[PDB]
Amino acid sequence: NEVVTREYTINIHKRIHGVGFKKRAPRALKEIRKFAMKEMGTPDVRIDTRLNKAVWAKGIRNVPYRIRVRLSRKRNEDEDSPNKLYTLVTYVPVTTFKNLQTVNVDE
Amino acid sequence: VRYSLDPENPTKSCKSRGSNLRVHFKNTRETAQAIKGMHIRKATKYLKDVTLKKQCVPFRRYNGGVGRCAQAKQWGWTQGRWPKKSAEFLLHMLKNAESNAELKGLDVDSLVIEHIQVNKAPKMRRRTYRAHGRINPYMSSPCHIEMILTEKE
Amino acid sequence: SHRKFSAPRHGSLGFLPRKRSSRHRGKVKSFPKDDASKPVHLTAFLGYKAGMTHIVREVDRPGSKVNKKEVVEAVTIVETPPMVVVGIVGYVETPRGLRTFKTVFAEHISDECKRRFYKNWHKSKKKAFTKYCKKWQDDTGKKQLEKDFNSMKKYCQVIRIIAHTQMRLLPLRQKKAHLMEIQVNGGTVAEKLDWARERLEQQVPVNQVFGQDEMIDVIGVTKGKGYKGVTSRWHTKKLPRKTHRGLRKVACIGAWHPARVAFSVARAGQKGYHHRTEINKKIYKIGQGYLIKDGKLIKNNASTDYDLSDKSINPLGGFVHYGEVTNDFIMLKGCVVGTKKRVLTLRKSLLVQTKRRALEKIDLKFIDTTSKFGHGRFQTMEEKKAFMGPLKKDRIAKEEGA
Amino acid sequence: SMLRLQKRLASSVLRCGKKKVWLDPNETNEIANANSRQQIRKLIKDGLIIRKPVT
RNA sequence: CGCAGGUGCAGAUCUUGGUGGUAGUAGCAAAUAUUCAAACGAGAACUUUGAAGGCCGAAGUGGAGAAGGGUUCCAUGUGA
RNA sequence: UCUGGCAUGUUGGAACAAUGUAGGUAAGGGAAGUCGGCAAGCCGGAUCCGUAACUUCGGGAUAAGGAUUGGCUCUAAGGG
Fold first, then answer.
1. Among residues C319, C360, C330, which one has the least CA distance to residue C71?
2. Nearest residue to F38 (CA, C1')?
3. The dihedral of CA C307, C308, C314, C315: what is its sign?
4. Counting beta carbons within 10 angstroms of the beta carbon of residue C23, is it exposed (0 to 12), middle (13 to 18) or buried (19 or more)?
5. Residue C167 DSSP one-character state
6. DSSP assigned state of C213
7. Contact C203/C110 with Cβ under 8 angstroms?
8. What is the C-alpha separation between B19 and B96, in angstroms, rounded?
9. N6-acetyllysine: which positions carry it (chain A)?
10. Max CA distance (Å), chain A
11. What does DSSP assign to residue C33?
12. How many whole angstroms separate alpha carbon C11 and alpha carbon C263?
């Protein structure tokens, strides 16, 4: 199975811990890219602009502790790039993070 | 023109060179030395790995102030770096040599880099401003590179 | 000219090289002197530093101001699961020193001990000792083993056991066992060999090596602290505030005429991760470790004969940066070298213990078990639940269930 | 392509600053063709160039 | 064979030019800060567009002039 | 902060060692440091009280010393 969508909770708090004030939001974006690469093995990770807004919503210092994202492996044949498969990361707005498991998504 | 060395037999060899290349001579000399003697496919794979920082070039002669990395043990050495510009320039020249081999009818899957040398090209002059109203030289160190590949298997 | 006012030098040259230790495991550099009249016994053991807590005891030194009075003493807990004997080493005395004569290994060696023989166990085929073990089964190989024990009997003066720790029982990420040579003291070389042979492949608990209220030596590697200046490494005086080019340094690193920096001058460099041997650490307790009896788990470690709290040596929330202690442990007075999880070497004393402090018999009245993850104030979870009362999370659970 | 000229031209035509000028990101090719103030005026009337509201 | 010299260099902190080791070293640390996506393109951390997060905070990092500069102004193209 | 302007001031990535530059904090003492309180720290606004010696009668004077200060709901007075 190549095309697959899953929902995750990423603990930005424990991946940001210790980094400087002027670098917390910029580093949180690179941590989401690393998370997407490890979960779905594609080195081509694309982050939706709405997810970029969610990370920066409180500035460069006070990044949200937890973010709920949707990872979506799709074919890169639309671009015919050297990398065959790519992952798109979108933002999932939630009210609470309690009891939120990693969930398979189908349509 | 004239190369430093003549191939053992010119029929089974291809040549490729370049002049006044804006790469650091000291970095390219070490990269060429690591490339020397290697098969053309293994040299192409190695130079791409130098770009990705997966394999390193051992800095043996021009090593003053060079850091120490784990990948240098593969070369029996302690100091190594990842000269990206030198690896790109040598990748371009390897592609040129491979195209010359195809033109004259040599199989490219048995090609060995038997000769490679880098020479200091004429320097280019710029300036830096150095306090108390002084101007100091700010020079580049380009290089000529030539390689001879020979069929060997 | 002379130093205006005298002051003792900063630091000691007895620990001079002040480098990173070449070994991670502590090394016994001198075993206790052998006495043939004493029974056969081991002289060292391997443990792991779990954490520190404090105890309450009443002292029994008559002329002191704390005589018959209750005192609080810091202690360290060293988790010591049993060791497995896997080999025997023989040594001969030569005018050039002690030389390794012959070593013999057991037939079956566990995978955790074999892990010590590889740098990449994942890529290995696990072929270590696969031909040696076949010698224990073959008839020709069995004769060679008997001859090799006989040569050790008639030629060796020192006999040691190769033993390893069981890291299955420890709550550590690492799965590779620590191997060690432990010298066998007492008896004759023949009696040492017979003792070694019969408990080959067997388990040696820590209670058969050390006893209660005895004073032992702890060998290990100090906590690492990286590159440090002379102010922290050697504790030199800080230069005044208005100093140019640096306060935290030694002003004069030598006189003119010797024309060299001497080795006795404080310089910046590596601090910590030093091999050290502290010598007088008393055993306050030897814990029993968790055991299942009649289907119920016994947690009674660290319950004295004055509290009977039915608690464990484990503090509330567990030891910090170390898992739960479920095996036998040694409680030592004071502090010991190393980080948490650091492997410690415990060996018997080289000295004769005759002072009152070393001979006194200690009996704990209380053992602190409050959380070390903050300002803990409850010894047990049952005590905390009784004091606090029902909480919202308990009522929510009751609502969900009903 | 580069739209430095068009952001300057729409700024002068709309009588606003260049920070209030909006060029449609999906119509870059058509906007790049506009090299006159009069074509900028047509793009404004077509909605391809918009004056953003004040903050 | 004779005739005549601006006739022999290791030095002169010598003169002019060229080149090393140092050395792939010192360094590219004053004024809070960047991120996501797309477009053109052989090639993008740095160009442009859009969306975010920030700064100058009207004695401005704004809008205009005097001296001085002299085409640096504007469009198109190139990337030595 | 808005209008307007910008892309952090001739580069970026990773790490968070010593020494440093810049900014802080510190138990108990309280200048014992040092040539020297250098440096830092204390005080600091406004309202209501209260202010010495000395004096060229002008001052010294914010001398010194003390109290108050938030939010909310009211009341009284002050005009065309």
1. C360
2. C242
3. negative
4. exposed
5. S
6. T
7. no
8. 14
9. 58
10. 41
11. P
12. 13
Where helices occur in chain B by DSSP H, the ranges are 25-35, 40-51, 84-103
Phi, psi of C163 (to 5 degrees): -130, 150
Stated in angstroms to one decimal place, the resolution of this structure is: 2.5
Give strand ranges (E) for C248-327.
269-272, 275-286, 291-293, 296-298
Strand partners, A10: A67
β-strands A85-91, A45-47: how paired? parallel
Over the range C42-75, which residues count as b (16 or more CB within 10 Å of their CB) and which as e?
bbbbbbbbbbbbebbbebeeeeeeeeeeeeeeeb
Instruction: Tell me the backbone φ, ψ of residue C228, rounded to 5 degrees.
Output: -140, 155
- Residues forming a β-bridge with A91: A69
Q: What is the largest CA-CA distance in chain D?
A: 30
Whether nucleic acid strand F comes within 7 Å of the CB of C59, the answer is no
Place of tokens 């398979």: A104
Determine the Cα–Cα distance for residues D47 and C360; give it in Å rounded to an integer: 95
The answer to whether some atom of strand F lies closer than 7 Å to the beta carbon of D20 is yes
Whole-angstrom distance, CA of residue A24 vs CA of residue A57:
12
Distance of C241 CA from F43 C1′ (whole Å) = 25
Q: Which nucleotide's C1' is closest to B22 (Cα)?
A: E80
Chains that touch B (3 or more CB pairs under 8 A): none
Kindly report the bases of strand F lying within 7 A of a protein C-beta atom.
1-6, 14, 16-21, 33, 36, 38-39
Q: Is the CB of D55 under 7 A from strand F?
A: yes
Backbone angles phi, psi at C367, to 5 degrees: -130, 125
C176, C135 Cβ separation under 8 angstroms: no
How many whole angstroms separate alpha carbon C44 and alpha carbon C83? 11
- Residue A82: enclosing H or E segment and its boundaries? none
Q: How far apart are CA C179 and CA C161, in angstroms?
A: 10
